[PDB]
């Protein structure tokens, strides 16, 4: 409603962020600043790199910058019945152009690099963006914003912080569209309320892990703190290996003849006048940690990687690309749980909002005919795979075309049922054949 | 009946949850919160990742988001006799459209990511969802709900908790359809009773392990606490490896000449004025744990994985995808015990409930003609495999077509019996042959 204060909202958010400070701490801070400061860093490089690696993967997959978004009609039973007759061609002109415009917009409006700087962070739990009319995006963080619902995941009251500038984006009563004003510490800047029709206009927070739900969601690399094992281990081996073999102080008894200055002067093969070995070193005693530590770190790297999707072409691996391709595909889905969640905070929202802000009538041109609800491609995946198998078999049945005992057409249809591509373009009817012959 | 209190129901549920706190504890909490607070975590990353990996697998398999659900007629002996005559084509139009609508509904209504956040948890013992009319789902947890039967697994009295909001979903007497009201702590909110025709409308709890049965079921990763071996082992090796090789305190006797500040100052090759080695380190004595621990962890990983159906594309394994494909298929069934149980808390219920809530007459359009009971595809599996073998053999018999001693047709029919694909589309009759020749 009307209060308005983000202090109460921040109080509601503390545990989610802190779990985030941590997660930030062992990878590539920053990302998050801990809570004159000379730098501190992440020793455990492998944990940090993976995060950067994912990002490329995430950005590309979420949208390849060629043709990601397909705006669908989608068919109403009279809209599919008119057109017919074959105005569908100009439905394509209206849409492709919108599709032609957005693909020249978003790359042209430089969201992608900005999205990538924010997206990567999202692999740390997540964050709000986007404004409308150079027109860039902005990238509010977990130090900044507070949001709610008691709900299934919707938006009720958004709060923001950058400089001090607070925004209220409240869902209203006796209402519908949102209303959103900005404030200073009392009361209003006169940049007034926009009702904001539902999600459209603007600016949705992306959830990421959805558990259980009623929060600004807590994900993710928090599911992987087997890196804690690597980072601690790497540091344990390094100091212990480093300090003993370098810091070799020379103890002398200052009782006489052995004088430190003369000792440095003689060359390796030199003789030096000294008491009988009075001065001696304090090189440390036997230190272990070798075998267990090394294997585990290597073992941890292998376990860690399949999380951060790396092609991981070790053997290395030779034979080779198909094997590499198979490795990528089985591994890729592992993230396929995420894709659905990512898509929900991203494709629908991203295309949905700009399209809604492209209702401005500036060359969007149609005031959208509901519904042109559009969704986002991406994996099908299996359809290429299911289809491929018939060729491997069908190829098998080429030799037996001549034999008269069994009907080949019936047999393919049997294999056809095994790979769920059934009919409609895969079976050839009798009427068609003479035309050729 | 009418009481109404979830406190009594929660009391009935304690052991099932706690076994769940635990199971949560060694994998990726959270999931479950244990029972300010900073963070504690799962060291044993491999146990945690597997759970995430399964999820992708589970979601995809349970429903690929292409064409999972096949609504069947199913044939009544006059409905199969009328149609004929060949109105079956418009039975397909009525159904496909329902099928065309649900496939555009569920992906379009964003259940899938929400289902995935809940589904994964289900690989921890399980949980309730779904509401009717943005229209998302909600994802009640083991901290929330209580349910019963003395029975074979049905539903008698459901209780819920989110904020305080309690729901009663009681099976009634002198009855039939369910009735469901919501309450505050006395007595009713006037969102009144819906009879709810049996399962339809709404909102079935998913069981998962069915043992013995009469409960909110207790599964699963509780069948695998050979991870306890890995997690404990990983932590035992890590602290022991870490603490000794890093924390090297320098003991000095404060009796004189050896002064701590001077000691740090000299460079590795420096000489330092000191008593004859008075100060000395307390680097710990020989510590074992190397050989036994490492192999077992590696051994445990191998044993653990075939549980969480990782592709396990190790050698690596170059030969290869057919080999990779065979590995996936034999391994996949291992979970095939689960699929039946998963399907029962999922495909029937999920399609059954929305179809029942699509009886609203909003474009579902038919008030369903009983029975259109629909079921869910998914493995058959063997039928592709059984069928494939005839081609490998039949191919073998191509060479002997010319020889006159033995009848080839009779021989194929013999092999045909070996691979249970018998007849009906695999044998060619005499009448057919001339047409071609």
Author numbering:
A (entry chain c), B (entry chain b): 12 to 46, 51 to 148, 155 to 184, 212 to 362, 365 to 428, 434 to 492
Task: Give me lines lifted from the publication on this model.
Escherichia coli bacteriophage T7, a member of Podoviridae, has been used as a model for understanding the DNA packaging mechanism common to tailed phages and related dsDNA viruses.
The local refinement and reconstruction improved the structural resolution of the portal to 4.9 Å. The lower resolution of the portal structure in the capsid II suggests that the portal might be flexible to some extent or deviate from 12-fold symmetry during the DNA packaging. The absence of the barrel in our capsid II portal structure and in the phage procapsid portal structures suggests that the barrel is not involved in the DNA packaging. The portal clip region interacts with the rim of the open icosahedral vertex and five protrusions around the inner capsid surface. A structural comparison between the portal in the capsid II and that in the mature phage revealed that the portal undergoes considerable conformational changes from the packaging intermediate to the mature state. This movement causes a squeeze between the inner capsid shell and the wing.
